């Protein structure tokens, strides 16, 4: 029958006898009162990963079968709270009235149901919005070494979504719980926390809660997409999820593979990452863009988790530690970062200026890689080296200060059309500062045409605006 006896309790795992009618991924409840996710249905004993604290359980205890399958609470009530993957509040502020529940595991949308990705996801980060564009429905990896800028870029994304509709989410896996608190207070201080949900599994939590955290986060995101509102999901580190799977599988005595990761890993991540979509007008016009992050060890590449995820995602951003400590922030290598969707997502004004900027920076990347060591070169190369140095200095940016797209296109246009030759490389971060103030003191009609039209203003008036500012600005 459907009540069984436990016969191991080691290490955060159990084994049990009986439970004839059990199912893979079912919930089963212990006499202590916490419940477990059945995950190997072997020949005579059921493997039972345990959620919550496991110290109380002893052999000879009984497990009852809940009959339910894994489900997440969903509603409009969650927006503005910090919540546990099983669905409980952990923030104070009391219980949340979640009207209904969705399954954790379910089929994604078919090939016909989707549409092409044609509307942007403006982030406010000049080097991304210009050179590695994101469109709503796109899935894009950010991969870099530790302390390079994964969470700062995530938070700049969630902060910029105040101006355009986005029911954003943020999932923290394995994190130090005081860092999560510093993040949440940063989202509160920048006035941004009331339209977003934060899901927390801290490092202390038992292994399955780290493992199930992104599956429940996306289960929360897709309800809003079915209603028809745009959504954004961020997973703060997928690699820690993969490690929780490894440790869980090794304790279950499953045949291992490369490193020791179980062979299922690529399927497990594809089950997570292919729910992201852009549904058709017949299905409501929604979106679910996703931004997973992977931490690479020492600039490692061709390893098992990074190559899996790099094969799944429709683009990748690679961050370089040696760039960061050289003053480029957020540090982004244009040479190794690609977006297959790119070009289509951008606004038409951006498409004209950002397409040429890619050509300029690629040409100088190669010329500088070899010819910078020699002191003096050919004139035409000294010019292209000057344009590349100004390009990287003009793409440096501050922390938690998103720039609206209207004033991005006007600075990139000023850069590509070569208005910045007179100004020195050190003074540029001040040329930007004094120019954006001037652009709110004068030129409001330019920005208004760009805001709704998505279109570059008449070139006579744009040049008149930049030439007047270059009258005002004082060179060191």
């Amino acid at each position: 029958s459907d009540v069984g006896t436990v016969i191991q309790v080691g290490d955060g795992i159990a084994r049990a006898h009986g439970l004839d009618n059990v199912m893979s991924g079912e919930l089963v409840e212990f006499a202590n009162g916490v419940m477990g996710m059945a995950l190997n249905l072997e020949e005579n004993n059921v493997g039972i990963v345990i959620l919550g604290p496991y110290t109380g359980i002893k052999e000879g205890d009984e497990v009852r079968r809940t009959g339910r399958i894994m489900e997440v609470p969903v509603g409009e009530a969650l927006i503005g709270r910090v919540v546990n993957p099983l669905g409980q509040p952990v923030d104070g502020l009391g219980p949340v009235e979640t009207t209904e529940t969705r399954p954790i595991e379910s089929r994604a949308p078919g090939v016909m149901d989707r549409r092409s990705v044609h509307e942007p996801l403006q982030t406010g980060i000049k080097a991304i919005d210009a050179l590695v564009p994101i469109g709503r429905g796109q899935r894009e990896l950010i991969i870099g070494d530790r302390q390079t800028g994964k969470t700062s870029v995530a938070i700049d994304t969630i902060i910029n979504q105040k101006d355009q509709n986005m029911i954003s989410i943020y999932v923290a896996i394995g994190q130090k719980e005081s860092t999560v608190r510093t993040v949440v207070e940063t989202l509160r201080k920048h006035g941004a926390l009331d339209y977003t949900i934060v899901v927390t599994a801290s490092a202390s939590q038992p292994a399955p809660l780290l493992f199930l955290a992104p599956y429940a986060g996306v289960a929360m995101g897709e309800y809003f997409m079915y209603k028809g509102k745009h959504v954004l999901v961020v997973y703060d580190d997928l690699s820690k999820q993969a490690a929780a799977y490894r440790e869980l599988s090794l304790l279950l005595r499953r045949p291992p593979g490369r490193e020791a990761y179980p062979g299922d890993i690529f399927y497990l991540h594809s089950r997570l990452l292919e729910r992201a979509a852009k549904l058709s007008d017949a299905k409501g016009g929604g979106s679910l863009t996703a931004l997973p992050f992977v931490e690479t060890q020492a600039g490692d590449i061709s390893a098992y988790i990074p190559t899996n995820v790099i094969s799944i995602t429709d683009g990748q951003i690679f961050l370089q530690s040696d760039l960061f400590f050289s003053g480029v922030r957020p540090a982004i290598n244009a040479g190794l970062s690609v977006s297959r969707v790119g070009g289509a997502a951008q606004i038409k004004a951006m498409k004209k200026v950002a397409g040429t900027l890619r050509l300029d920076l690629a040409a100088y990347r190669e010329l500088e890689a070899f010819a910078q060591f020699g002191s003096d070169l050919d004139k035409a190369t000294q010019a292209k080296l000057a344009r590349g140095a100004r390009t990287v200095e003009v793409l440096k940016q501050d922390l938690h200060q998103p720039i609206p797209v209207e004033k991005q296109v006007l600075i990139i246009y000023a850069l590509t059309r070569g208005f910045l030759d007179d100004i020195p490389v050190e003074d540029v971060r001040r040329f930007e500062k004094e120019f954006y103030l001037f652009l709110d003191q004068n030129g409001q009609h330019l920005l208004e045409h760009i805001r709704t039209t998505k279109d570059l203003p008449n070139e006579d008036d744009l040049n008149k605006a930049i030439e007047a500012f270059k009258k005002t600005f004082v060179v060191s």
């Binding site: 080691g10 290490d11 002893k58 923030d91 719980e177 490092a203 202390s204 440790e247 060890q297 003053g327």
Partner: protein, 471 residues
């Protein structure tokens, strides 16, 4: 029948066979009292910690002292609870073994003392606090590039022989005199020599009155080494909760907790991972590290050291523990061999406290501009090896020029160094540090010989050295 029998021994591990219905919970503790009955045997008192069940009433257990002598069919008793530490006011000034018995010759703890479990769940998200401010500590580099955090985890990472314990002893000499709070010092994977040297250092300065101490040592079996970290932490936890004082915790080497797990895990019976480590690396290390938290009730600052297993940081045990630490110091062998002490990696030192809000603009600009010059110097070292110094120009000539001087001026004479070398030590205020590195970056003192900048406190001392060398 609550008495058991040992059925198998396998080194550190032992396997007991309790009768049905009395299996102890995980993390409980068990006692061995055996009369040496015959001329062949050896008497022993040993205690065992339960670590897994294994069916048919068997439980697998880690011994806390060497298993030399145990026999199949010898009896085991059950305490009923975790390894129980006596805590309260009377702990201060005493030194304990891992089990909570004093070893200091002064006496034994009154039996009326409340004694507490070592295993309990970590503090929750609502309880934490994040009001962040500088634990100003006078170590010139740490006061510049990676400012330590009052109430925050601090980490020292280095290979064997680079200079972690000398840094901890300078930290105790600077902080533990003025902190005004209970200090707990726990030795995990500790040399017995350094334990004696510290106990005499604390008595000679009188500091021993406020602090309490727990020791395990390199010669101990692995179970003792693991459970010393938890016994030390339970003391610091009581003082910050019940008394509400700020508390200072030191753990001598926390890597040996994970390594001792690596030893005893394969005998327990669970498959290797990425380089022989147990499966449950990150969950059990995170379980310990998530307890060491500054709740609203009262702050802990904790300073830890971690031995990288080789000079390789990509190893699993360093990799899992780099996340948990607010401010991290990386000690690298290559600098130490040049004679620069403490050997701190300027480029790889990371701390949350660096942020214009927390340090202020004057101090921030300088931390980043100094890291920028040293990173450019690494790039120039390669090309000068091919072409030579004579081929560099302008911004590349002055980076090598200033990066030599900065690399030397981050070296300081510690007040604890006076035993290894004849020198007197120094304490440097933060303002003198930020002015000093600013003055080097401006180039006001560029004429002084690069020899002078080594093992020095302030720019006035460098001018005095350079004057004696004929400037």
């Amino acid at each position: 029948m609550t008495r058991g029998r040992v059925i198998q021994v396998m080194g550190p591990v032992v396997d007991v066979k309790f009768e049905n219905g009395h299996l102890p919970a995980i993390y409980n503790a068990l006692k061995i009292q055996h009369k040496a009955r015959n001329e062949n045997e050896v008497d022993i008192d040993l205690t065992l910690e339960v670590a897994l069940h294994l069916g048919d009433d068997t439980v697998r257990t880690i011994a806390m002292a060497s298993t030399d002598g145990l026999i199949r069919g010898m009896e085991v008793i059950d305490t009923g609870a975790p390894i129980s530490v006596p805590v309260g006011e009377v702990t201060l000034g005493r030194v304990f073994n891992v089990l909570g018995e004093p070893i200091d010759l002064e006496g034994d703890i009154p039996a009326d003392a409340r004694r507490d479990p070592i295993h309990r769940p970590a503090p929750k998200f609502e309880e934490l606090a994040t009001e962040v401010e500088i634990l100003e500590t006078g170590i010139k580099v740490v006061d510049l590039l990676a400012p330590y955090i009052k109430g925050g985890k601090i980490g020292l990472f280095g290979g064997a022989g680079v200079g972690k314990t000398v840094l901890i002893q300078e930290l105790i000499h600077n902080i533990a005199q003025e902190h005004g709070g209970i200090s707990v010092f726990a030795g995990v994977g500790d040399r017995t020599r350094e334990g004696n040297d510290l106990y005499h250092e604390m008595k000679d300065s009188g500091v021993i009155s406020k602090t309490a101490m727990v020791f395990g040592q390199m010669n101990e079996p692995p179970g003792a080494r693991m459970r010393v970290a938890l016994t030390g932490l339970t003391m610091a936890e009581y003082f910050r909760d019940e008394q509400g004082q700020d508390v200072l915790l030191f753990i001598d080497n926390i890597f040996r907790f994970t390594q001792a797990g690596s030893e005893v895990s394969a005998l327990l019976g669970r498959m290797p991972s990425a380089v022989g480590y147990q499966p449950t690396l990150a969950t059990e290390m995170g379980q310990l590290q998530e307890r060491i938290t500054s709740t609203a009730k009262g702050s802990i600052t904790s300073i830890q050291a971690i031995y990288v297993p080789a000079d390789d940081y990509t190893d699993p045990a360093p990799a899992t523990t780099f996340s948990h630490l607010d401010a991290t110091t990386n000690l690298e062998r290559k600098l130490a061999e040049m004679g620069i002490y403490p050997a701190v990696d300027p480029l790889a030192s990371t701390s949350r406290a660096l942020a214009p809000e927390i340090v202020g603009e004057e101090h921030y600009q300088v931390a980043r501009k100094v890291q920028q010059t040293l990173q450019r110097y690494k790039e120039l070292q390669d090309i000068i090896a091919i072409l030579g110094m004579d081929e560099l120009s302008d911004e590349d000539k002055l980076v090598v020029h200033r990066a030599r001087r900065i690399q030397f001026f981050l070296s300081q004479n510690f007040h604890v160094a006076e035993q290894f070398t004849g020198q007197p030590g120094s304490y440097v205020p933060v303002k003198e540090t930020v002015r000093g590195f600013k003055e080097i970056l401006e180039g006001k003192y560029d004429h002084l010989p690069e020899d002078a900048f080594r093992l020095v406190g302030r720019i006035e001392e460098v001018v005095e050295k350079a004057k004696a060398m004929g400037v």
